[PDB]
């Protein structure tokens, strides 16, 4: 079976919108989201239909780019730091589920560099 997909809303959290979540959003995902290799990410991995029943025994932390689209489009975060690392997350799953050389493991480097690349600087 799947597991439920990561919250994008909890009452119990404090919401917050900074310059920088905001730019995370309007620039960071909605950039990367284009990307010809995103159509992994824009979505919670859906175990059923990739027949991939080890998934979830091996990625404890699923994250995707959907789920933190909709965080953001929520307020979900208390600062961009949050955010952040909800795509280091993503990344590394996708490390810690492949191996090097891997189709999709070449796909998340080029969309890690590009997305160091666009957090190098953010607005003040
Ligand atoms: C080795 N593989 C297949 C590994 C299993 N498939 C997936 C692994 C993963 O961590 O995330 C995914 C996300 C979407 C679709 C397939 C996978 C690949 O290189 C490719 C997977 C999808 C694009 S190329």
Same mark, same amino acid.
């Given at each position: 079976?799947?597991?439920?997909?990561?919250?994008?809303?909890?009452?119990?959290?404090?919401?917050?919108?900074?310059?920088?979540?905001?730019?995370?959003?309007?620039?960071?995902?909605?950039?990367?989201?284009?990307?010809?290799? *995103?159509?992994?990410?824009? $979505?919670?991995?859906?175990?059923?239909?990739? @027949?991939?029943?080890? !998934?979830? &025994?091996?990625?404890?932390?699923?994250?995707?780019?959907?789920?933190?689209?909709?965080?953001?489009?929520?307020?979900?975060?208390?600062? *961009?730091?949050?955010?952040? $690392?909800?795509?280091?997350?993503?990344?590394? @799953?996708?490390?810690? !589920?492949? &191996?090097?050389?891997?189709?999709?493991?070449?796909?998340?480097?080029?969309?890690?560099?590009?997305?160091?690349?666009?957090?190098?600087?953010?607005?003040?």
């Amino acid at each position: 079976m799947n597991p439920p997909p990561p919250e994008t809303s909890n009452p119990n959290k404090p919401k917050r919108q900074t310059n920088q979540l905001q730019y995370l959003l309007r620039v960071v995902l909605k950039t990367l989201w284009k990307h010809q290799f *995103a159509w992994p990410f824009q $979505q919670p991995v859906d175990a059923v239909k990739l @027949n991939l029943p080890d !998934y979830y &025994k091996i990625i404890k932390t699923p994250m995707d780019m959907g789920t933190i689209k909709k965080r953001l489009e929520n307020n979900y975060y208390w600062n *961009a730091q949050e955010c952040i $690392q909800d795509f280091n997350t993503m990344f590394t @799953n996708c490390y810690i !589920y492949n &191996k090097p050389g891997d189709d999709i493991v070449l796909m998340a480097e080029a969309l890690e560099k590009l997305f160091l690349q666009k957090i190098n600087e953010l607005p003040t």
